[model samples]
Target chain A: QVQLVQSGAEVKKPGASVKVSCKASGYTFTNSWIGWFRQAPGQGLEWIGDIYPGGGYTNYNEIFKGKATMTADTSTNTAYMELSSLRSEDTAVYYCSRGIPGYAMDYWGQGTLVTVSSASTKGPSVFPLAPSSKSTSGGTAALGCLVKDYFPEPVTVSWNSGALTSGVHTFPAVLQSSGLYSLSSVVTVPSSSLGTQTYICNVNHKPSNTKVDKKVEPKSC
Target chain B: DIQMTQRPDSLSASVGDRVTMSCKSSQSLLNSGDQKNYLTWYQQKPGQPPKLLIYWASTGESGVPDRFSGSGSGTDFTFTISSLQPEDIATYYCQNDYSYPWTFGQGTKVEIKRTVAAPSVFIFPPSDQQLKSGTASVVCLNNNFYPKEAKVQWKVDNALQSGNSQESVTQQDSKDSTYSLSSTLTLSKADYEKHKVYACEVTHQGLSSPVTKSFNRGC
Candidate 1:
């Protein structure tokens, strides 16, 4: 059986760069292609790109355009991916996939986490924007909870009442001089079962494990 | 630009069980203006790189077993493995080759929860009793190896030889669940007479020593 072993995790600051590596064994390495993949913390997998060790040819997914550089060393039977201009958004787990060109990924490395940090300790101010609500003829009511100014992204917004939620928090994410981000999101609550009781919006930032709660009253849409 | 995605990020199965998954493209992968689905699927096992499993929606790769199948087009697609063998416990992915900036699905990981037996193998030379003056064709057959992976070698007149080399990736027999393969060699009848002796060698993980078969002129 062939095996692919990846390098260890790395931590770098903004504007810095990092190079990860994957080693191949048990077969002719240069005879096959090596593909790279990325998975941001709490996110789905993304195709970074692939490279053939023999010809030194490479291909990338559009999303990874200009964001990643892939290379291989035939003598060592190893492949590498280098990410430059690092940012908090670049923090992710990277893996190397192996197979023939245009074929399936038959083998993979464990994965390496790359973190881009500037070491800022200040968190963003959470604004509990007024909640929008409406009465639908019956005793049930619907409400939309909007929050703003959460910084450095990697945030998770959830409802306390188990109501419906939006895709993801979207915002301008204004970057401060301190190397952090400013973003926001909205979550909707189904108050069809209760009265004027207040609902809680929890904004959890992944990096720091910090959360801020905002209680708001639902108003008509 | 179209996006590929899969569901049930992961699953668990036992050997001989069936497993399936779904893949969807955010937008129409086929230019409907033309009528073609630009897609492919792959299998990735731990410590191993991904290998192309299917392409053009439903076509399997070279040497791939028929048990792994793909179906669907344009936006919605499905890939199914009829039997979950021990080696099948790997991650599956869907990719779009219709255009540049190609994309791949998140990948569905399958874990085998039980064990299955190894492939049983059989190797033989072609009866190819046909002997001619100028040219000739000879064949070798290897069969009944379960799990379907093995290698074969050839020799002539006590020296190593490269046959027409027809082996198999992994083919199954309904009656016994074993696999089979074959190889053929060729030469002028004059050369065959001069060499006089020929042989076949097979090496498998389960076998302690390589299996060798030989044939002589009169026989």
Candidate 2:
């Protein structure tokens, strides 16, 4: 029943700093260790580092060596991560997870989204996820696009070919805590033609007046 | 950063036996100036989150039983349970807090050694719905077993078949406190037409020999 509740989202400008807190309950706080992970928009998770709150000891990932500092308040049973010199690249969901010796990470706090923006509208980041050849119970193939880390909202996607338009499914924009937006679109096709042809996805970001194209080709499993 | 190594990856003991495990750190966990070793121990049960047992090397967490004790210093440490309880069947892990990026030991699993209850085997042929849908599926039920683990294998005409086509779910029977494993083997209609006999073979610690039940399409 151990719980790690984290602070809410944050919006900061470039060069500014922010502190995210993770409050532990249902267990003795100082008896366990706390760790941090960062998942950037459309990217893999990166281990930031961890700390032993009871003794103020810390370990950092070399990449975040000088950018982040971890601390804890024994009286409040809370762990904190302070990141300095923030930039647009630091736009991500920061997660605070609990780790114990001899076990995999079992408890995680709801992520705190950090958005670093400047005065002007930021362009969208567009990428394609690997296409799946076949669904578990369906006779179709699924292809996906990830569009995120954009400012000023409103984006649209259309497949280049009419054949790919029939199954287009666009998700609604999800505004992150930092005020930026993220969205994804998917297209499904008959499994028989999965590896036979290439399909194109075109994204239009209105605020930044940007157009991006991602070409995807599904292969048989 | 300090590395941690745990010993005796697994051990078997009786209900009341004493159990001990060790964790060795690459560097001394002792904070020289404070005369304290920054080490902690945790216990985890199946499907449950780990619970903190001892920290600061030898200090027990609040509400933890007095039977659990921690000792040793510097690079080596030990966590012991004075008398093991059936509920203590779990994995024990030791972590070092003396350095940054605190690392944990690999963990030691404690298993209870005892005789388990035997399971009864039963096989059901394709159901009416399955036949109406143009499919052939056979089911195997292993019932009333203790220790909650069993394996089922499928065979066709005495020839061993892969278990890949089988799906199973195990659950505890509330009334008897025993377990039952129900499994289904999916086969194509063509396969059913070509095969004469299908069998389900079960294996468990409670049975001295594998128990098997057979089914015929016509029967």
Candidate 3:
């Protein structure tokens, strides 16, 4: 018989969305069906929904109808569930169970945890400032982003190159002469780098106490 | 309909030892008259998906080792490993499909309580083709490591290259019953041409010396 393998845990903030995966093997995948289950820490289980891989048709639990999206990939023998518009109540462990008669979810995938926390609240408006990119006739490529007007000593900036460098925080969230706690860092992406790629500037700062989050997207070449 | 919950959350066991875990269902999952329980148990290691171990209450899944046994009926059930093996170091979970809207337990992790072996490391450098503009991906893979956590680092000209790095979730090698990790670092041709050397380092508690790989092939 085949087995159902699931994805890992995830941590996200409220209003964000997350997608979990479950892969099947050893059996004719498209011939069978799979469903998802959710369990909060120290709690029982909640049936999320089910999906048929052969056709990608899905039927979700009434409570999860709008909260979860179910789909499957036959070529990869994998099933997926995406939960959107997250809330603290969505914080829980989710499992993928193989469909069977009656109440027997005969097979299951490992659980994945989803956590939702706020970004940051205090200090000047902390933003993962819009990125700045410059190119010269000499073929020099530079992409930079600044975290403007924020409190605290040091802040973090990332460009998805896995190269996260620490720049000195201007000190304190207090208003500077320019009312800025701004810090910026830049990285070089091969000009020939695919234009389909987006260089993101993720400023990892806790923006709790206030629920103001401006969605930021990656800068495409 | 029945709901199942696992106990202890986590456990520690050694090879040649016996370990038992329980899954309690809120209502009877047994088929009346036939009295056959409708439940299944699963096991999962890091990075991989869950595997069905025992199904139909106490029947071990086909090809699953005889060491795994399932018992109990109705509401409460048990999944036991008669002689735990190194590969058994994984989280165990139970599910009740005997009812509509199937549900699962939180999960019970079984940890290895012993001295584990390290792994052999290999690094696959990116293509050597000279590039005017574009990106290259370098991968570092460590095979057969225990405990399943591999820390990867990249360096350019002795400076830690804070480039983009991504790692595959930990995976277990079924053949050796150890773990493996493949982490890749993406770099641009501009950075590649600017530096003479790029090196990758992998560290794990089980490894005596951190495995290091350098790109010395003069791009």
Candidate 4:
């Protein structure tokens, strides 16, 4: 039978990097392709990319563009994946797997955990801006806190309120593709937490050891 | 992407019992647009060529038994051997034909169930049995015994021989160290015009070597 064995965990500070490996056994390793995935703490899984060992072909998930690289060595029947520009949000388990055409993992290795800790030195920080409102009638809300300065790494913005009970508490993530980091999350508030209630936007960036919060009252579009 | 690893729940089985092999795909095989499916199954019998059983999901290869079928779409696909026969004893494998970097499931071995009664013997004809005037036929019995199955091949004067007519009969002997069997070969009368050498080649799995027998036939 074929078995896939994986490497160990890593701990790094903001702006650092990490790499992991997966090895194959009991089969002709060169005939197959390898893939990688990311599972952030308390979040769903995301595809990183894949590499074909025989011809050295690769495809990356748009979200991981410039963030992850995959490679394989056929002689040893092993595959490797590397992650750069590390941030606390990158602190999660990474997995290596075999990929079939068009991107699906058919074999998986045990996951390797990576943790990004506080930065040793303070850096530029972005202020969080508060969301403006919250309501059940499918209205919009301005969410984020105001920050005096912004640190490119280790910074996060998210929205939450009593009425929002079903979906996950999500942060407004910046897309490298658009080149704009400042963004907002829109959610439907439950009727129970409508009018007269408050919604919140929280910001966290480390080593400056700071957090910012802003509140919003219900308002009509 | 999800990677699936599957092993036989049980390694041993008797003849006539059903056997099933499982495969897990690393990810969901469902594609949103194309609606095309990709997957294939194979059987590797001792001393025999690998046989294609099912492909493109549930489509059975021509000549495959009805008892052999595949089901389940997307990431989870299953191969079932409904009523295993003594002939069905072999290793089974599954592969994904849809994508590049094709992969195979680990193999599962199906062995004949042993009974206390005197073991029954089966005789199978050599595959391929015809030769033209100048050309020669190769009669081979692919009994993959080395890894645990035994098969023999017959040849004439270093040229491979073919056809079942030559074999007067086959016999079994248990007095030896391990259970063993044998087959015979006969040359055609036309070839007899010139005296020829006949030989038998025996093959098995891990053993360091094979056994051979050679003799000369006079016109």
Top model by TM-score, which number? 3
**Please, what are the lDDT tens digits per residue for candidate 3 over residues A17-95?**
9998888987777767787877664454578888878877777777788889999888898888999999988877788
How accurate is chain B of model 4, given as a TM-score from 0 to 1?
A: 0.51
- Candidate 1 per-residue C-alpha lDDT over A40-120 given as tens digits, one digit per residue, 9 for 90 to 100: 633556778888898998888777778789999888888989988888898877888776654455567877767677664
lDDT tens per residue, model 3, B1-219 = 455778879987766899999999999888886677878887866434567787788877668898999999888889889998877877888887676656688889887655576645444444433132265555554555677667888876778866376555443433345555555565666666667776777788877788676656343
> What TM-score does model 1 score on chain A?
0.53
> What fraction of the true Cα-Cα contacts (under 8 Å, chains A to B) does candidate 1 also have?
0.22
Evaluate candidate 1 by giving its C-alpha RMSD to the native, one decimal: 32.4
Q: Is the docking of candidate 3 incorrect, acceptable, medium or high quality?
A: incorrect
For A125-215, candidate 2 gives per-residue lDDT tens digits of 7655435421211565556565656875456678874456664555556565557666666565676766666777788775467789877
Minimal lDDT window, size 10, model 4 chain B: B168-177
The digit string of per-residue lDDT tens for model 1 on B77-115 reads: 999989877667667888886765667788897764432
In candidate 3, stretches whose alpha carbon ends up further than 4 angstroms from where it belongs are A1-221, B1-3, B28-34, B44-52, B61-64, B73-75, B86-90, B111-114, B128-133, B149-151, B206-211, B217-219
> What DockQ does candidate 1 score?
0.08
Q: What residue runs in model 2 are displaced by over 4 Å at the alpha carbon?
A: A5-34, A37-48, A51-59, A63-221, B122-151, B156-160, B163-184, B189-198, B203-205, B208-210, B213-219
- Residue A130, model 2, lDDT: 39
lDDT of 4 by residue, B34-57 (tens): 664566676754322245687766
lDDT of 4 by residue, A127-221 (tens): 22222221112443322232222323334445563334332123323323222222222233444544565666555544345665555443223
